[PDB]
Design a binder for this molecule. Structure first.
Ligand SMILES: [Mg+2]
Ligand SMILES: [Mg+2]
Ligand SMILES: [Mg+2]
Ligand SMILES: [Mg+2]
Ligand SMILES: [Mg+2]
Ligand SMILES: [Mg+2]
Lengths: 165, 156, 267
RNA sequence: GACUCGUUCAUACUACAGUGGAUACACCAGAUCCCAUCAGAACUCUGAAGUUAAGCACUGUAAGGCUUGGCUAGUACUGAGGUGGGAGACCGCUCGGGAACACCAGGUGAUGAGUCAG
RNA sequence: CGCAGAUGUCCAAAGACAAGCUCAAAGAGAACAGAAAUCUCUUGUAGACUAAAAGGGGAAAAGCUUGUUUGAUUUCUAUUU
RNA sequence: UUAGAGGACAGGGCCUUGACCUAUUCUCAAACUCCCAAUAGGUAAAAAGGGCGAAAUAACUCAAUUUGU
């Protein structure tokens, strides 16, 4: 009635594995896609096989909501022509998928910028989620109010008319 | 070599009890103190400022000084053929109002009215406490059906 | 996967204080606010409590005794209807007026109102009280500082700074604070939402139009309410419960419920 | 029927369930302004279309935990005496003090100050 | 000349104050990505961290991140080990 | 630190031995602790003092020439 499922947010993530020019180009790609400034993530460790160090920037990501999120999700799902695996849904109620080329989202290619991939992840939830995030009297959500794995698949099929493999 | 520090030998003395960690309550800060009062020194390890020394944990004294957050206490201590008065300065969390005095105060208050009444009727009153003494004789009724006989037990 | 909430988990657990557990009381701010000098005794150090709920604001005077603190004055935001202010009872101005009421009511209870006149229309030693802000975070423009200004406009002395008033991050401008006291910002929002998207104006301020309050007379009703509050601050001179609360059982009753459940399962 | 500030700091916690909305407590509708971020999610400000689904309140689980009695048990241990026993290791007597785990049964709160509606 | 160990150092911040925040780890899920890169979500009484031995203390903090600073300043008493 | 039992990633092609989880089971600690004695310790048990009223002195304290001390 007012326990229907909406989209809480959407996070786009590009892990380049190195710092320097390529990371900045990926950040520019994300900015043109979202009209927002992204931020960077840093390695907590140092791994010799990967060649990365602590406190070193490795990736860039951004989070979106509102009307803007539902259309970026629309584009991404369209590149998948509305088909997802059943393994893509977690047992808490979220899902996600990936893409190989950022051109197919309608962004004009530039010879200098190059090609990049990214990830999509949604975090479905109902309303009343405020009580677990506010400062004053934060509490816990009851178990019935959560979104189970099957509710997530029904929501996907009913909204986007997609099919599960 | 020998190790005689300030907090040596206080592993179990200065530790919190089971499921009773954390800093003190807020009412602890509303306690009333006056000059000459009796007080107990009990170290609270979760406040590291102004802790007492090892020896004095659990002793009782009198107040000789009150400050912004501190109290001076007079405490006896045995040194090898005599007793010395020590002046201990501690902070207010390690201080508790002593309960060693309350029976005397209640006794005085209660005996006041008994004296006033006895003199009002011109009676003879005795107010000193009585030590437990020998018991008087009595006649105890018991049905014969209620006495159970016992005897030593065999070994098993 | 090894379960983490074992029996040994529940045996070793220590629980916080109830009001910390409920997200209401700080308990580091509180004790620093109640404690006084141990040799300055027979002084109580009152505090001025401001709480803002949803659709209302509250003010109080506390005393912090040993078996539970005592309240000496109290005023709620919904009282302002009697003083001529219809709906709008969460404003900056509403909080200021509520803070004024508590001070004026507290002075009259002691019979000191004629000696401490405070300040007139907005532009012995006084009794002192320290501000208790609760859980919220204190940014510039927070409504708790309007209630403080209203209480100081009465006879009370509440110590404070100047950098937390609206528009005063690094320069104190009294004009901005005065405009927010009189509700100019709300009137300007009403003005600007009318030029564009007029239907949103009709929906958003639905009870302002319904109660015949326009954008042009917002300041005057607050200026009149201040005077009426100063004139007379004295507080104005069994329910049915159609639903009923279920009660608890006992040991003997619980056994028969097990008898019945097992018997029903048998066949 | 509800709220604000407290005191005990689990009989007050935890996991699942059932029931409730005159006023109130909430979720909730927005971003011009004070303010805030990658992000009006949070924080801050301005409101009153919708809902008890959730927070919250009361109750229910041969529920876990916690708490109070009974038992374990005069058992384990121990102060004073002995030209007591025994190769010893160890163990009784006289005058006295006295546990713990486990197991069984009941319980799941109480309260200070001040207000609102009716 | 019993047992297991440590000291002759180190820090303009690792000193002072305030605010916001919550940590180890496990599970499920996301292009290259794998046992371990970076992202969300559930659980989480400290299983992390707190210069250096060991012990005590610590969760809207004493831990992490920010902002402003030089109370690591001059003089004197009552006293503890 | 010994041993089986019941459940749902390694293995020789539907079964080893395992791994993981759940309830048990034999035995232990000067430098382990949910609990916790006997013995050994400390303070108190009224007259230079206590109780209950009024008045006076302060440059201290308080919103207070009355608030307190
Ligand atoms: Mg604070
Ligand atoms: Mg319901
Ligand atoms: Mg039970
Ligand atoms: Mg600890
Ligand atoms: Mg802090
Ligand atoms: Mg044994």
């Amino acid at each position: 009635v007012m326990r229907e499922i909406k989209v809480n947010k959407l996070v786009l993530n590009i892990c380049v594995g190195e710092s320097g020019d390529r990371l900045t180009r990926a950040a520019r790609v994300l900015e043109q896609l979202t009209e927002q400034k992204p931020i960077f993530g840093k390695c907590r460790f140092t791994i010799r096989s990967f060649g990365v160090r602590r406190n070193e920037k490795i990736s860039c990501f951004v989070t979106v909501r509102g009307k803007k999120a539902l259309e970026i999700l629309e584009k991404g799902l369209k590149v998948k022509e509305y088909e997802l695996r059943r393994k893509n849904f977690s047992d808490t109620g979220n899902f996600g998928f990936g893409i190989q080329e950022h051109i197919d989202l309608g962004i004009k290619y530039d010879p200098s910028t190059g090609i990049y991939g990214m990830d999509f992840y949604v975090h479905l939830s109902r309303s009343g989620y405020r009580v677990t995030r506010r400062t004053r009297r934060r509490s816990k959500i009851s178990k019935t109010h959560k979104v189970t794995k099957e509710d997530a698949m029904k929501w996907f099929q009913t909204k986007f008319d997609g099919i599960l493999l | 070599g020998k190790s005689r520090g300030k907090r040596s030998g206080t592993r179990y003395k200065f530790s919190k009890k089971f499921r009773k960690h954390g800093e003190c309550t807020a009412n602890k800060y509303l306690e009333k103190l006056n000059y000459g009062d009796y007080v107990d020194i009990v170290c609270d390890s979760t406040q590291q400022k102004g802790m007492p020394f090892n020896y004095y944990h659990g002793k009782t004294g009198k107040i000789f000084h009150i400050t912004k957050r501190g109290v001076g206490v007079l405490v006896n201590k045995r040194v090898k053929h005599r007793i010395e008065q020590k002046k201990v300065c501690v902070r207010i969390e390690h201080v508790r109002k002593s309960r060693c005095n309350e029976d005397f105060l209640l006794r005085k208050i209660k005996n006041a009215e008994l004296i006033k009444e006895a003199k009002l009727k011109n009676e003879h009153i005795n107010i000193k406490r009585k030590t437990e003494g020998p018991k008087p004789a009595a006649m105890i009724k018991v049905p014969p059906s209620k006495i159970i006989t016992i005897e030593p037990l065999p070994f098993y | 996967v090894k379960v983490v909430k074992n029996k040994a988990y529940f045996k070793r657990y220590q629980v916080k204080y109830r009001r910390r557990r409920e997200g209401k009381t700080d308990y580091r701010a509180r004790k620093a606010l109640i404690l006084q000098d141990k040799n300055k005794y027979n002084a109580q150090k009152l505090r001025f409590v401001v709480r803002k709920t949803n659709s209302q604001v509250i003010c109080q005077i506390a005393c912090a005794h040993i078996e539970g603190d005592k309240i000496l004055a109290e005023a709620k935001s919904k009282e302002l209807i009697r003083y001529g202010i219809p709906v709008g009872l969460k404003n900056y101005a509403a909080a200021y007026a509520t803070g004024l009421l508590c001070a004026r009511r507290f002075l009259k209870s002691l019979n000191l109102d004629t000696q401490f006149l405070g300040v007139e229309k907005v532009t012995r030693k006084p009794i002192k009280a320290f501000l208790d802000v609760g859980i919220t975070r204190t940014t510039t423009g927070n409504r708790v500082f309007a209630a403080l200004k209203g209480a100081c406009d009465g006879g009370l002395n509440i110590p404070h700074g100047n950098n937390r008033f609206p528009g005063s991050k690094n320069e104190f401008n009294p004009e901005q604070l005065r405009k927010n006291i009189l509700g100019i910002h709300v009137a300007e929002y009403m003005k600007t939402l009318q030029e564009e998207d007029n239907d949103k104006y009709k929906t958003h301020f639905n009870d302002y139009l319904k109660n015949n309050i326009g954008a042009d007379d917002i300041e005057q009703m607050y200026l009149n309410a201040h005077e009426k509050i100063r004139q007379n601050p004295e507080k104005e001179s069994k329910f049915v419960s159609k639903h009923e609360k279920p009660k608890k059982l006992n040991a003997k009753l619980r056994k028969k419920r097990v008898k019945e459940k097992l018997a029903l399962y048998v066949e």
